[model samples]
Target: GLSDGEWQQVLNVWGKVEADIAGHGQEVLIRLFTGHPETLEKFDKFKHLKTEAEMKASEDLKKHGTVVLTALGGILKKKGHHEAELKPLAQSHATKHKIPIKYLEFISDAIIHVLHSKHPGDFGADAQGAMTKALELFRNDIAAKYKELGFQ
Candidate 1:
């Protein structure tokens, strides 16, 4: 739970940065693969991309990277998570992707890291905390139904 002020800060920062949709999304995936190369192995489409250049050159990377943002962005946009927003994606991640709990957690950190590097001008100390708390709220919603999400 964030103070109202914190929520406002997050919304403001997100509003400023999300205007550049392409840069915001692809940058995180690039950072994710760059900082955590092993995660790339799970993606058949991206597994061959060993370097930042290769990941940048990949259309799949752009689509999937942007997918992560748009998916998560829906919840943030409304200041709350709706099952409509969280489900299906969560369902696929759990059932089809079988993503481990650790990587799910990893993505939260990846969000913070990418925000800092790609939009440092907007992602300040306070905004980072607010973003983290906001994501934790999202995590709580997902955790309540791990059975459906397959978070093991």
Candidate 2:
């Protein structure tokens, strides 16, 4: 469960960063692939993308990077962080993407890292905790879907 303050932290932090879609989107992908090479493998589109430059240059990665942030921003919107916002992203990753739970879960860590690296103060302790909790909720929902879909 996220506190009101936690939710606010998400709004304050992610809201600002997500504004520059192309720049921040590239930052997310770069940090993600740099830290976790294995995740890049999840995308068939990224196969044989050897260099960091090549990965950064990827049009698909750029597109989905923004989509990923947009979906995240959707979850952190004004009214609430509803299951409605999270469910489709989770379900699609489980069903359509066939991505395992762990891989799906790592986005939380990567995003948090990106935020701190890109903008430090706004993404402080409360914000970080909120992010972790928020993504945990996403993981739980997606995990349930994985079980339902026979992902084990």
lDDT of 2 by residue, 102-126 (tens): 7755666777777787776756787
Winner by lDDT: 1
Off by over 4 Å in 1: 147-150
Q: Model 1 clash pairs?
A: none
In candidate 1, how many Å is residue 2 off? Answer: 2.9
Clash counts per candidate, in order, are 0, 0
- Evaluate model 1: give its TM-score: 0.87
RMSD in angstroms, all models?
2.0, 2.2
The TM-score leader among the candidates is 1
Instruction: Score residue 92 of candidate 2 by CA lDDT.
Output: 78
Superposition TM-score, candidate 2 onto the true structure: 0.84
